[PDB]
Amino acid sequence: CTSVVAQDSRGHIYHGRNLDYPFGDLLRKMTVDVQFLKNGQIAFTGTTFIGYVGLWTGQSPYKFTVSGDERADKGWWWENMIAALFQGHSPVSWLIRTTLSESEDFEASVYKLAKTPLIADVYYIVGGTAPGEGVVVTRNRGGPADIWPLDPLNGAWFRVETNYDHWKPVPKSDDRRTPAIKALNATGQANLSLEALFQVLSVVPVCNKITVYTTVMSAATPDKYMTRIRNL
Amino acid sequence: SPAPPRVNVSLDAAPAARWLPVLRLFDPGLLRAAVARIVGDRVPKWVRDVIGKLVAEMESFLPQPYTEEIRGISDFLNLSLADGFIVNLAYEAS
Numbered sequence A: 001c002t003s004v005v006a007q008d009s010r011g012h013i014y015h016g017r018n019l020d021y022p023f024g025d026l027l028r029k030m031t032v033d034v035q036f037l038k039n040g041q042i043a044f045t046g047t048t049f050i051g052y053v054g055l056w057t058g059q060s061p062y063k064f065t066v067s068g069d070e071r072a073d074k075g076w077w078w079e080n081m082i083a084a085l086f087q088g089h090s091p092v093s094w095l096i097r098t099t100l101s102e103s104e105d106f107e108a109s110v111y112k113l114a115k116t117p118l119i120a121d122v123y124y125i126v127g128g129t130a131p132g133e134g135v136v137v138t139r140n141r142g143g144p145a146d147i148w149p150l151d152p153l154n155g156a157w158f159r160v161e162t163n164y165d166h167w168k169p170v171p172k173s174d175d176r177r178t179p180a181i182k183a184l185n186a187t188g189q190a191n192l193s194l195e196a197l198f199q200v201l202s203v204v205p206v207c208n209k210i211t212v213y214t215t216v217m218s219a220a221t222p223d224k225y226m227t228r229i230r231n232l
Numbered sequence B: 001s002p003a004p005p006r007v008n009v010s011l012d013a014a015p016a017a018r019w020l021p022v023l024r025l026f027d028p029g030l031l032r033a034a035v036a037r038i039v040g041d042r043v044p045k046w047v048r049d050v051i052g053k054l055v056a057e058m059e060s061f062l063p064q065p066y067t068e069e070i071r072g073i074s075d076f077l078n079l080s081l082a083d084g085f086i087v088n089l090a091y092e093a094s
């Protein structure tokens, strides 16, 4: 997976993500953009698969956008897992959807995604509606290992997250980080937009054989939420 | 690159029944067979039977509304509650 949260020269936040998963031959046919309605209004929007209740990509209009990437954890037993469910722990995709349903604003959603205990490790990428509102939350089962924020005034106008910790080098066999940085580097902060970010997420190998769908979004312009099925 | 279908899901409707308009999009019969086969081959039968009992007995104590929603998906697709629960937890199972 590849998630990107970035800021243009005006202070607008952009959020994009690629979902790579095997069995994609089947999933691509099952990808839907779901608008969850509550009290006669669109509470939030998410991209999921038919039969799957959690969200790995979602949007709270004019509040925040969230996407989740996979992180490798310690070996977990199915018995320990059910215990974690009853102990009170949450699946990583169910916390994303809960946050989209409950959290009032960007900072409150980052707090929920960082502190809530989880069954497995994950990366939470969150984007907001105001300058500098972008973070990569590296999660353990217990809590936050790190919180990597946007730093545009120091030249860090984008954060890239794949499936490895951002402070360690990626495997030479699966290096989709540097090509995503090269493409964002080449695009430039001033030329950043949803469509320019979609182009970045169409670069190979950021988009590869197992990529299922691409999403670009911005909580401040919730009508521009768009998903594309890849390799279909 | 085409866009996925865009469908509404009402959180004002019962959890077990709010996903049905979405389930009728893809071929449900093909989805049941695809889920039942892939879960059947990777998970032995005795584990699935136990998973079913736990989820059904402790439905009140597992997270909501997700569990009651998985109950309604599996009932519409004629899947075992264990089958619907394992696919929804496929990430953690890895």
Ligand SMILES: *[C@@H]1O[C@H](CO)[C@@H](O)[C@H](O)[C@H]1NC(C)=O
Residues within 6 Å of the ligand: A155, A178, A181, A182, A185
């Ligand atoms: C991206 O651009 C910066 C220049 O601001 C440079 O220091 C960095 O090495 C570049 N990274 C890649 C992967 O090209």
Ligand SMILES: *[C@@H]1O[C@H](CO)[C@@H](O)[C@H](O)[C@H]1NC(C)=O
Residues within 6 Å of the ligand: A035, A037, A041, A042, B006, B007, B008
């Ligand atoms: C979804 O709801 C909106 C208003 O909430 C409505 O305009 C639209 O037609 C609905 N779409 C579907 C596919 O039900």
Ligand SMILES: *[C@@H]1O[C@H](CO)[C@@H](O)[C@H](O)[C@H]1NC(C)=O
Residues within 6 Å of the ligand: B028, B029, B032, B076, B077, B078
């Ligand atoms: C599921 O079984 C019900 C009867 O309980 C039947 O009406 C329905 O057509 C079946 N659907 C599938 C996808 O098997």
Ligand SMILES: [Cl-]
Residues within 6 Å of the ligand: A115
């Ligand atoms: Cl704590």
Ligand SMILES: [Cl-]
Residues within 6 Å of the ligand: A073, A074, A121, A140, A141, A142
């Ligand atoms: Cl851990």
Ligand SMILES: [Cl-]
Residues within 6 Å of the ligand: A160, A161, A162, A163, A164, A165, A166, A170, A177
């Ligand atoms: Cl990475």
Ligand SMILES: [Cl-]
Residues within 6 Å of the ligand: A164, A165, A168, A169, A170
């Ligand atoms: Cl690593």
Ligand SMILES: [Cl-]
Residues within 6 Å of the ligand: A193, A194, A195
């Ligand atoms: Cl735009």
Ligand SMILES: [Cl-]
Residues within 6 Å of the ligand: B011, B065
């Ligand atoms: Cl509810």
